[PDB]
């Protein structure tokens, strides 16, 4: 089949900002190429059709290019509805199709640290017999941050589950919590838990860290 | 133009489940009809178009498996799914498929899960208020909703009198087949001490209520 691969992944972009992103094809499929918005919680939206043709109702700022193995969207100036991810889909006769891994938008603010917690489990939790440890990283830009665990100053890997929040709308930071779960028996068997972070924000590593007990 | 979809839900693999699209503003006798799936968190994809004329396709994912029909005299679109698998979770869109896989009219999707694991309301944690999440006169708090079973829980904080500063993040699913998702909140140091914090979460599919004072 056909592959399509979408840049930038990521783009972070102001109110008013000409945009545009990129579509490219494993092989040569010369128009049969549509362009859709997609808002978290809603369906798709399609904007453009064989390549070129603005699909009715679309705003005129929105306009595709390219054709073969080569395309190209573009908003010639930024608004506020337009923060949203991105698809382009080669069409096809029959159901597979293809559609691109996306390319999404959001909201240029300046660097944020973020602002680092660290939480212990719960007496009662660990009457269950299972120790959830959570380190929360605050508000923060861009969204691209490293955790590390570090249970008695050694890394951990494979424990843990990170979850990011959509960007906030009214600061455009983002805010990310890492959950290090283990056994009881684990838990008690360590003293130092650690949670080290790494961030554009920041000039060196933060750790925080707690003593169990 | 209208789309309405429904027959979504919790479903156990090997099982079968039937969705239906509702359509208004147009014949679905004359147009080809199409499903598209999003499972949580992914891309976009085609699995199944009925042509104007009844023919029908389908994508390897799910041939075999799904079949597409719909009800003309009710203007109704289906999609019959047998032998489920995990990999089927996914919000399921109908859409008016102008020919070649191009949607301009979509459904609101309709959620379905398909596990093995049993409805189950979510232990609530406290994660609380310390010195290592206080820094200046600003401290985090908030409650671990943990094990829970399926999707949706919902978290307020002061039964909603509280909203600034909140995070509910979006739910993780562990390798136990569970979720676990944690709400917090920044709030004034000042306030610890006087100020009580109760996180109030719902799970409405387990008629689970809980109310979780959180304190230092």
């Known amino acids: 089949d056909i592959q399509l691969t979408q840049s930038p992944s990521f783009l972070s972009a102001s109110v008013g900002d000409r945009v545009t992103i990129t579509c490219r094809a494993s092989?040569?499929?010369?128009?049969?190429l549509a362009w859709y918005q997609q808002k978290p919680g809603k369906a798709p939206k399609l904007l453009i059709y064989?390549?070129?043709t603005l699909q009715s109702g679309v705003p005129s700022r929105f306009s595709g290019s390219g054709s073969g193995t080569e395309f190209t969207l573009t908003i010639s100036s930024l608004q506020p509805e337009d923060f949203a991810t991105y698809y382009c889909?080669?069409?096809?006769?029959?159901?597979?199709?293809?559609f691109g891994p996306g390319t999404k938008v959001d909201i240029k603010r300046t660097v944020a640290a973020p602002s680092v917690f660290i939480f212990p489990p719960s007496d009662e939790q660990l009457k269950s017999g299972t120790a959830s440890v959570v380190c929360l990283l605050n508000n923060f830009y861009p969204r691209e941050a490293k955790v590390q665990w570090k249970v008695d100053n050694a890394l951990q890997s494979g424990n843990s589950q990170e979850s990011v929040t959509e960007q906030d709308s009214k600061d455009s930071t983002y805010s990310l919590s890492s959950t290090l779960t283990l056994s009881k028996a684990d838990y008690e068997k360590h003293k130092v838990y650690a949670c080290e972070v790494t961030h554009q924000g920041l000039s060196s590593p933060v750790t925080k860290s707690f003593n169990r007990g | 133009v209208q789309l309405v979809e429904s027959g979504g839900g919790l479903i156990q693999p090997g099982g079968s489940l039937r969705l239906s699209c509702a359509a208004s503003?147009?014949?679905?006798?004359?147009?080809?009809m199409s499903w598209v799936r999003q499972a949580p968190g992914k891309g976009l994809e085609w699995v199944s178009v009925i042509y104007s004329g009844g023919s029908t396709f389908y994508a390897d994912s799910v041939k075999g498996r799904f079949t597409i029909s719909r009800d003309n005299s009710k203007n109704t679109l289906y999609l019959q799914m047998n032998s489920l698998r995990a990999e089927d979770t996914a919000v399921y869109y109908c859409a008016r498929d102008l020919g070649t896989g191009l949607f301009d009219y979509w459904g609101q999707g309709t959620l379905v899960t398909v596990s093995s694991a049993s409805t189950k309301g979510p232990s609530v944690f406290p994660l609380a208020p310390s010195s290592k999440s206080t820094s200046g006169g600003t401290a985090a708090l908030g409650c671990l909703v943990k094990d829970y079973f399926p999707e949706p829980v919902t978290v307020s904080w002061n039964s909603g009198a509280l909203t600034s500063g909140v995070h509910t993040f979006p739910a993780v699913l562990q390798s136990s087949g569970l979720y676990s998702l944690s709400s917090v909140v920044t709030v004034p140091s000042s306030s610890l001490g006087t100020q009580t914090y109760i996180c109030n979460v719902n799970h409405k599919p387990s008629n689970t209520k809980v109310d979780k004072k959180v304190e230092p």
């Open positions: 889909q080669q069409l096809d006769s029959y159901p597979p199709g293809t």
């Open positions: 092989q040569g499929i010369s128009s049969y």
């Open positions: 064989a390549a070129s």
């Open positions: 503003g147009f014949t679905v006798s004359s147009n080809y």
